[PDB]
Design a protein around this ligand. Structure first.
Ligand SMILES: Cc1cc2nc3c(=O)[nH]c(=O)nc-3n(C[C@H](O)[C@H](O)[C@H](O)COP(=O)(O)O)c2cc1C
Length: 359
């Protein structure tokens, strides 16, 4: 099976092509992770996936999505990850982390606590920042503060510090969160970026925050460990061919700047869109980016059906298959997939204290 073939990227070898993508847990306190995350992540690693990417972890307090988001904006925050990293490694999975800044979509409630911007008089809330003072709208009506050049320098440095911290905590894989309408994505999109300085207007200017952040992170992130990013390559906003073309150009510049793999997603930059949700619906777009930027890719949404994951790999649409919600439902999804695909000794996807009994 293609799904259970190993994958080598730089010095890191994944035992199979199953990636667990970043999934916010909303269980941290002032950015500090705790035994929620420890057990969640170690349990997933033991389930058999080759790569486990820790949830969006804020590079700065105001870059959290919610009051429950993880952070890595101090060395104490980073140190909290060390035992979890060590547990993921003990289980034979590769520990990754997504470092993030939520931009104008920050200061929101947890998804089961309203999922909306925090009310003005709620002591938990904070001012958001963005390339331009324009609200997302809908359930995220707060108008962000327009970033100064010093803010841009500071946030880039926060990404650098976060990457340094992730390195020193023992992560073997990093993902820059430039997708899903958060700060990076919003610098790229003309919907959200109305700047007239070096960081807006033209394609080069809109790309600049993302490329400069990648280059700055590259200085401190080891060359022998995969350097990746998530990026929304279209919005389903009636501008898809032009947006895709630009996104693919940016992917080429990412590759030239040392990016090893791109997690291809949707932008979610604005609410007024028409996304054609369906099983593996991003497969063909991921394939186009892979082909036209000549860059390894992953993607997500509905690949928890093992045969569909297998088909996407065999069609060379993807290099890794990201499987999210199916792993919340069943942390041992990789074992289920091995069984479904008829892999020999499927139960040994799991560690011996499980595998022996399930043969
Ligand atoms: C609980 C939850 C939290 C998520 N948090 C993030 C995250 O931290 N960063 C990210 O880029 N995507 C996040 N996503 C998107 C997932 O990585 C993934 O793309 C999405 O769930 C689709 O894959 P699936 O159909 O296999 O669940 C999250 C989704 C879920 C379900």
């Amino acid at each position: 099976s293609a799904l259970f073939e190993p994958y080598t990227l730089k010095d890191v070898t994944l035992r199979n092509r199953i990636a667990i993508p970043p999934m916010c847990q909303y269980m941290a306190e002032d950015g500090m992770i705790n035994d929620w995350h420890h057990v969640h992540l170690a349990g997933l690693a033991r389930g058999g996936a080759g790569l486990l990417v820790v949830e969006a972890t804020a590079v700065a307090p105001e870059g959290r999505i919610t009051p429950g988001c993880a952070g890595i904006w101090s060395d104490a925050h980073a140190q909290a990850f060390v035992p979890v990293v060590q547990a993921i490694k003990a289980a034979g999975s590769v520990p990754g982390i997504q470092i993030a800044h939520a931009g104008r979509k920050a200061s929101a409630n947890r998804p089961w606590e309203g999922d909306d911007h925090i009310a003005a008089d709620d002591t938990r809330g904070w001012e958001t920042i963005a390339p331009s003072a324009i609200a997302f709208g809908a359930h995220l009506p707060k108008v962000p503060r327009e970033m100064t050049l010093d803010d841009i320098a500071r946030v880039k440095q926060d990404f650098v510090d976060a990457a340094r911290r992730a390195r020193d905590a023992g992560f073997e894989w990093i993902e820059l969160h430039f997708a899903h309408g958060f700060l990076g994505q919003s610098f790229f999109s003309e919907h959200s970026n109305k700047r007239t300085d070096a960081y807006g207007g033209s394609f080069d200017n809109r790309s600049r925050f993302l490329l400069e952040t990648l280059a700055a992170v590259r200085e401190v992130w080891p060359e022998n460990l995969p350097l990746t990013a998530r990026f929304g390559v279209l919005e389903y906003d009636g501008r898809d061919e032009q947006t895709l073309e630009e996104s693919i150009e940016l992917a080429r510049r990412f590759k030239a700047g040392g990016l090893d793999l791109l997690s291809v997603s949707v932008g979610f930059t604005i609410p007024d869109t028409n996304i054609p949700w369906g099983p593996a619906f991003m497969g063909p777009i991921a394939e186009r980016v892979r082909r036209e930027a000549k860059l390894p890719v992953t993607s997500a949404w509905g690949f928890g059906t093992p045969q569909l994951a297998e088909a996407a790999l065999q069609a060379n649409q993807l290099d890794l298959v990201s499987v999210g919600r199916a792993h919340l439902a069943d942390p041992h999804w990789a074992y289920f997939a091995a069984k479904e695909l008829g892999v020999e000794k499927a139960s040994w996807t799991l560690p011996a204290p499980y595998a022996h009994w399930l043969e």
